[PDB]
């Protein structure tokens, strides 16, 4: 993966692994990247359906903070 190597140190950009660092911080699942919100503080991803309560869709706000950060 070149000079910088993998973007993610934890999974090494292996798409066949679950990863709670570069994919959903709750379940590690890579599916539905379009429904994973990025926290504007910690930059972790979260499936709308992994949150509690689950969100139906992507919020229409300027920013979003995850449960760990908010």
């Amino acid at each position: 993966l070149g000079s910088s190597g993998p973007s993610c140190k934890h999974c090494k950009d292996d798409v066949n692994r679950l990863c709670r660092v570069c994919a959903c911080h709750l379940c590690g699942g890579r599916q539905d990247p379009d429904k994973q919100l990025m926290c504007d503080e910690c930059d972790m991803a979260f499936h709308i359906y992994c949150l509690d309560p689950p969100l139906s869709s992507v919020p229409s706000e300027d920013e979003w903070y995850c449960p760990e950060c908010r």
């Binding site: 973007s7 994919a23 990247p33 379009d34 994973q36 991803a45 992507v58 229409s60 300027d62």
Partner: peptide, 25 residues
């Protein structure tokens, strides 16, 4: 609100520019 997909697409776009297909020697 950014999604993981939007982040992945940004990265793909940047990489695409690096190919430099539009350059002759």
């Amino acid at each position: 609100v950014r999604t993981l997909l939007s982040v992945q697409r940004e990265k793909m776009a940047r990489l695409r520019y690096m190919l430099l297909g539009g350059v002759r020697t």
